[PDB]
Design a protein around this nucleic acid. Structure first.
Ligand code: FES
Ligand SMILES: [Mg+2]
Ligand SMILES: [Mg+2]
Ligand SMILES: [Mg+2]
Ligand SMILES: [Mg+2]
Ligand SMILES: [Mg+2]
Ligand SMILES: [Mg+2]
Ligand SMILES: [Mg+2]
Ligand SMILES: [Mg+2]
Ligand SMILES: [Mg+2]
Ligand SMILES: [Mg+2]
Ligand SMILES: [Mg+2]
Ligand SMILES: [Mg+2]
Ligand SMILES: [Mg+2]
Ligand SMILES: [Mg+2]
Ligand SMILES: [Mg+2]
Ligand SMILES: [Mg+2]
Ligand SMILES: [Mg+2]
Ligand SMILES: [Mg+2]
Ligand SMILES: [Mg+2]
Ligand SMILES: [Mg+2]
Ligand SMILES: [Mg+2]
Ligand SMILES: [Mg+2]
Ligand SMILES: [Mg+2]
Ligand SMILES: [Mg+2]
Ligand SMILES: [Mg+2]
Ligand SMILES: [Mg+2]
Ligand SMILES: [Mg+2]
Ligand SMILES: [Mg+2]
Ligand SMILES: [Mg+2]
Ligand SMILES: [Mg+2]
Ligand SMILES: [Mg+2]
Ligand SMILES: [Mg+2]
Ligand SMILES: [Mg+2]
Ligand SMILES: [Mg+2]
Ligand SMILES: [Mg+2]
Ligand SMILES: [Mg+2]
Lengths: 116, 71, 107, 168
RNA sequence: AUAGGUUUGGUCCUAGCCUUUCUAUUAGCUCUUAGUAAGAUUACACAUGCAAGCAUCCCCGUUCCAGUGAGUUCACCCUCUAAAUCACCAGAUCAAAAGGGACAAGCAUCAAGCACGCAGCAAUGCAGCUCAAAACGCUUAGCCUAGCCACACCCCCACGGGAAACAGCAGUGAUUAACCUUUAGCAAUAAACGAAAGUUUAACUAAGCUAUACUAACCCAGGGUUGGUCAAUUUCGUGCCAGCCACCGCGGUACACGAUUAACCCAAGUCAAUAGAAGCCGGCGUAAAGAGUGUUUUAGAUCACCCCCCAAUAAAGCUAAAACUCACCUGAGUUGUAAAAAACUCAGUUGACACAAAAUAGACUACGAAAGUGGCUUUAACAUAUCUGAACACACAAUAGCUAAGACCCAAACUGGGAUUAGAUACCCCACUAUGCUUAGCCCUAAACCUCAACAGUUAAUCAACAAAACUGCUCGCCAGAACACUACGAGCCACAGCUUAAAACUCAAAGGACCUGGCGGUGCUUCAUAUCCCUCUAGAGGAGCCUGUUCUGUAAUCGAUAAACCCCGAUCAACCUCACCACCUCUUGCUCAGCCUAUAUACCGCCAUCUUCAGCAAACCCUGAUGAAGGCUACAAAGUAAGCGCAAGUACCCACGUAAAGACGUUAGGUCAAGGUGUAGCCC
RNA sequence: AGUAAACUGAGAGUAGAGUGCUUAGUUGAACAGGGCCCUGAAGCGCGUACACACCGCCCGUCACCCUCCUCAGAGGAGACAAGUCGUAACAUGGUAAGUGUACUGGAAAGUGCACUUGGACGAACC
């Protein structure tokens, strides 16, 4: 095992439909600021943020981004205990603004990658 | 017979004595803390006894002796 | 031991079976955290392929990767069976080939 | 080899050889005997050998023992009616003591056979059920009757899957 | 178990692990058909549909059936007696509540629970009840399967609250390795209702899906394995790498890896992972195990009827030898040892002189439970029985150690100095302290070992090995692979760096006990070395120059030998050649039915070094060891006989002497691929 | 012992080439006795944790990667693995070994007091 660098944002993606999941994944794949901060896609799926998503986020010190999905109270409690951050969103550009915010936060400033 | 097992036990015992000598202070502090917590636990046990038995307070003129303290 | 002693002790209080690496389950699901190699104990010499997985039970363990060559990268899901790798100390889980993200060996 | 002198005493085959089954009135049996004395040898060997058999055949009778309490050995049976039967056993061999207790308080072979007849009344051959209680699980086992489908497939005529097609 | 593999250089024993067998789940690869059986991983959350009506209104039912296993000794027998059926009744059947008894697994590092009983009409009085034969407690589990117990979303309950409930059928999200249809019918049986024809029923019946299983079949067969256990591999590729293994193990130029062929086993399956079925009458001197010692109750056993003294212990007193100290005389050295140094000026004779220790006896073998006890006297005193029995208590327990107060001749950790050494925090020398002694308390440990429990009994037909011959009966204590571990945590203790009790995780296939053979021993005794180990004798080398070999340097410039057993060695021989080396140049079927002095002496032949300046090696037999590895010797002989080889003998030289020659089997994978040949691998303009 | 020492030839091999090798011959000595404190040999023994057989085996510290446990971070254990300092044990292991206990020390360990043989004292007198 090796300790992960600070400039590596691990993200779980959860969508209401496969179309939304694919759209978010395309946005992520457009990423080009690899040098300043890597954007790893630990796992993606369709449905409400689940215990397995929280477990992946805990295992990889990642952040779960939910697109028009729900985070039950039990899941919220477990994520709070395990130190994961679940960020639900209902607008694609709001989610993208949040994602760029996290990338800038991980940076050593504002990120240089742009979605369009 | 040979004394290989006795030699193994000898090395174990010598290393244990050396470790105790090397870490006596920490062991003393931990043991004192353990004794204090043991006394508190025993007092809690007696308190449970009488409170469940239905006494508002420890019996008349009763004070729990500190049985786990040297003094 | 006299008959009285046998009666007093009762039947032999056999030790309970102790769970192995897989918590006594045929397979577990893991997420490959890292991939690396390990030198086997003497006299064997090799760089055996291994990975670190967060098993579904919450424990992290080193799983051996059988077969000539593989592709397991980080973040990938694998199934892991028991059975110790004889020449690796402390490694007691084999990644099952042909399941989830670990494809069969290529001819 | 089994521990102890005369390990045969610790075999179900031996404990089933006991021929003494007490009447329902017998409830307690106290055996006073002496650990020494050539006259108490019969009682000593009776306690050593036959007491296991008596207790095995009579699991509800309280059998108690008493060493060197009185000058002579003796049995004493306390019955359900309050009666107490004292049986002197000095100078009698263990076989003689067993025969005497069988005569005075044991159940006769005819009564034992009557109980066995009552028992065998239960297992009616014609009943069908699990092998634990019945000789046959189903009528299929009886030859001539339509066999179990699991072994011999039924005709499409009888099978309900095709009776449905005929219904259609 | 009908067993098998695995500890070692080898054998025997003990022991763990694993293999072979049979199920079930999951996974991988693969799959044709028909009948039948069985089917979420989860007491987590649920969209949707359905699942309880009947009937002249009242009643009855919706408490059943069906479901799950969260919880868990409400399940079984007896007593008593509710509810229900027998058209009203009858007691019969069935069966609640209540009472009595029985009723799972693990942990005692859960040993105390804390009112857990009784008497009396009551008043109230007694102070008791459970528990090492496991109470109280923690963890785990549905069970004893014609089926039974428990739960019904949680708060045990369910007035109430949390909240809006599939653990009814089908189905779904989540979760797990685990994953069936959102079918039809009341045609049959069962239930509910009705007086009844009848009606309702996701109970059930008949269907749907699924190699999970069984049966049957097809003129369309895969899976696994092929080093041993264990059935069965050809050729390639790789070369301690890639990789394989249930265990032992394989791979450094492969019957074990990957491919390929073939074969072997099972076969619509195969077999990778997991789980279960296989688990106490065996042992304790050395393998783990007789707990440091003794004594109870409750109990168990039949071994109960049969039948002189020596050194125990405590107290008191005493002292012979020798020290120390102090006194006279003498002397200048004394101690120290492998040799010295440091150290004291003190040393010798004689006399006085202990609170320390207790020659000879003792070649005795006694006393005590054990630890222990061996100067003398006295006092007190050495339990009981014609059994065993304590972390379950009481009393002891060497030496060391702690607290306090005394003693202190001598010894003596520590400390200092001297010496030694590469260093010497030691071994050797000197001084001295705690301490060793007394008193009074603690501490409670020993290789506390005679590593062999107590009592009773036998020597009869033996006994893995060694040890101190082998056992029988009985009882208690203890042990179940190694290490973790005289450890961690808990508990108790006048203990505070402690003692007793004492685990688990991770790891391994071993660990271990006893022997055999050999090597080794700064190993013992004895006898030797005849140019040999020391001394002894002669002549040399080591100091000088030169010649020559080797190493190191240098160069474009060999190679090999290189401790004895290399170094004027391959060479009884290099200016060219020899020459295999280097630089430049030239040729390609080439002197060769090519060639290579290219690697491999760790594939070899061939010829040799070496102990060997040895006398042993020995096939084939026989015997001993319980028929184990192994061993085989006694001459006033006791299991050895041995062909053959070697030695020897014989031979050359000058004897019959001596020198040659010879010198077996083996060791150093000793040397030589560069005498030559040859296997393998390699270059072929 | 015609040995050492000294001296003089011949030969092999070369076209030539050695202070080298093989060989012939002459003069021609001294000690030869004590031993086993030193090295090896033999015989009988003893010990052995070695068996690639002491150039063996192997202990502990100091540093290095893993796995598990206890712990407010740190320690312990085991494993892998090489170095490091020593040589503590295995032979009388070079100070016999070990148990308990105490002091001391880079580290195996040293010593003190008692105890065990799981060492020997060679086994008539000598
Ligand atoms: S068992 Fe008889 S019909 Fe199936
Ligand atoms: Mg150790
Ligand atoms: Mg399958
Ligand atoms: Mg349960
Ligand atoms: Mg504990
Ligand atoms: Mg409820
Ligand atoms: Mg539910
Ligand atoms: Mg359902
Ligand atoms: Mg689902
Ligand atoms: Mg299934
Ligand atoms: Mg090959
Ligand atoms: Mg032992
Ligand atoms: Mg006794
Ligand atoms: Mg005792
Ligand atoms: Mg003591
Ligand atoms: Mg003193
Ligand atoms: Mg101890
Ligand atoms: Mg301790
Ligand atoms: Mg403790
Ligand atoms: Mg000489
Ligand atoms: Mg010179
Ligand atoms: Mg050279
Ligand atoms: Mg060379
Ligand atoms: Mg030339
Ligand atoms: Mg030349
Ligand atoms: Mg050439
Ligand atoms: Mg050779
Ligand atoms: Mg030679
Ligand atoms: Mg010769
Ligand atoms: Mg000869
Ligand atoms: Mg060689
Ligand atoms: Mg060579
Ligand atoms: Mg040493
Ligand atoms: Mg020594
Ligand atoms: Mg010692
Ligand atoms: Mg010292
Ligand atoms: Mg002793």
């Amino acid at each position: 095992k090796r300790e992960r660098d600070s400039n590596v944002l691990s993200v779980i993606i959860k969508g209401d439909v496969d179309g939304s999941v694919e759209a978010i994944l395309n946005i992520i794949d457009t990423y080009d600021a690899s040098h300043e901060c890597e954007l790893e896609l630990v796992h993606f799926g369709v449905g409400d943020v689940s215990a397995n998503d929280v477990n992946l986020a805990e295992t990889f010190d990642g952040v779960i981004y939910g697109f028009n999905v729900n985070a039950g109270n039990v899941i919220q409690q477990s994520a709070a205990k395990k130190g994961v951050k679940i960020k639900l969103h209902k607008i694609i550009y709001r989610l993208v603004e949040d994602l760029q915010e996290e990338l800038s936060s991980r940076l050593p400033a504002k990120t240089s990658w742009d979605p369009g | 017979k040979n004394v290989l097992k006795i030699r193994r036990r000898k090395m174990n015992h010598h290393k244990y004595r050396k470790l105790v000598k090397k870490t006596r202070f920490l062991r003393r502090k931990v043991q004192e803390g353990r004794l204090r917590r043991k006394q508190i636990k025993f007092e809690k046990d007696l308190r449970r006894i009488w409170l469940k038995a239905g006494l508002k307070e420890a019996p008349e003129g009763w004070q729990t002796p500190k049985i786990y303290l040297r003094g | 031991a006299t008959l009285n002693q046998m009666h007093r002790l009762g039947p032999p209080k056999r030790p309970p079976r102790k769970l192995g690496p897989t918590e006594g389950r045929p397979q577990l699901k893991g997420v490959v955290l890292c991939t690396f190699t390990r030198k086997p104990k003497k006299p064997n010499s090799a760089n055996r392929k291994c990975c670190r997985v967060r098993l579904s039970t919450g424990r992290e363990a080193v799983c051996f990767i059988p077969g000539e060559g593989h592709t397991l990268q980080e973040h990938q899901i694998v199934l892991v069976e028991g059975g110790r790798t004889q020449d690796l100390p402390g490694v007691k889980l084999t990644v099952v080939r042909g399941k989830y993200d670990c494809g069969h060996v290529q001819k | 080899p089994m521990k102890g002198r005369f390990p045969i005493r610790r075999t179900l085959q031996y404990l089933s050889q006991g021929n003494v089954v007490f009447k329902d009135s017998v409830k307690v049996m106290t055996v006073n005997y002496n650990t020494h004395g050539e006259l108490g040898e019969g009682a000593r060997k009776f306690v050593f050998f036959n007491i296991p058999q008596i207790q095995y055949k009579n699991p509800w009778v309280q059998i108690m023992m008493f060493k060197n309490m009185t000058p002579s050995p003796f049995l004493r049976f306390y019955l359900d009616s309050g009666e107490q039967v004292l049986v002197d056993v000095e100078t009698k061999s263990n076989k003689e003591i067993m025969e005497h207790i069988r005569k005075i308080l044991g159940k006769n072979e005819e009564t034992l056979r009557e109980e066995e007849e009552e028992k065998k009344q239960l297992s009616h051959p014609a009943n069908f059920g699990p092998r634990k209680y019945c000789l046959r699980e189903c009528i299929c086992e009886v030859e001539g009757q339509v066999p179990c489908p699991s072994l011999v497939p039924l005709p499409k005529e009888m099978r309900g899957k095709y009776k449905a097609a005929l219904k259609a």
